[PDB]
């Protein structure tokens, strides 16, 4: 119930997401990234220090953008094939 604990859970999930992302399993990375984002969101809800909140927020944004990149690539992929 501590943002440290959500944070850990989030970071854990985001690490798996990255491994998958690096391994080109984008559909699974996508889900993983988004699981991670749920935790980071909880973490920043339970955190009260505005500099720490800002830090978590900045990382949240970077993983959100990565996720959407993979999502575009992934639709555009078949759309180029199909």
């Amino acid at each position: 119930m501590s943002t440290g604990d959500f944070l850990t859970k989030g970071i854990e999930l985001v690490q798996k997401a990255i491994d998958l992302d690096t391994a080109t399993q984008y559909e699974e990375a996508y889900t993983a990234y988004y699981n991670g984002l749920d935790y980071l969101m909880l973490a920043l809800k339970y955190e009260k220090n505005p500099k720490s909140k800002d830090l978590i927020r900045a990382k949240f944004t970077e993983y959100l953008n990565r996720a959407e990149q993979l999502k575009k690539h992934l639709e555009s992929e078949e759309a180029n094939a199909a």
């Binding site: 119930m1 501590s2 943002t3 440290g4 944070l7 850990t8 970071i11 985001v14 690490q15 990255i18 992302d21 690096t22 339970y46 955190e47 009260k48 220090n49 500099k51 720490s52 800002d54 830090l55 978590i56 990382k59 970077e62 993983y63 953008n65 990565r66």
Partner: peptide
């Protein structure tokens, strides 16, 4: 009410954010 006030210097110690691929 179970909030934290976390010292960011320490947040950045006790939790290291992995980066995304290029």
């Amino acid at each position: 009410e179970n909030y934290s006030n976390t010292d960011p210097e320490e947040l950045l110690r006790k939790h290291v954010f992995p980066s995304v691929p290029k």
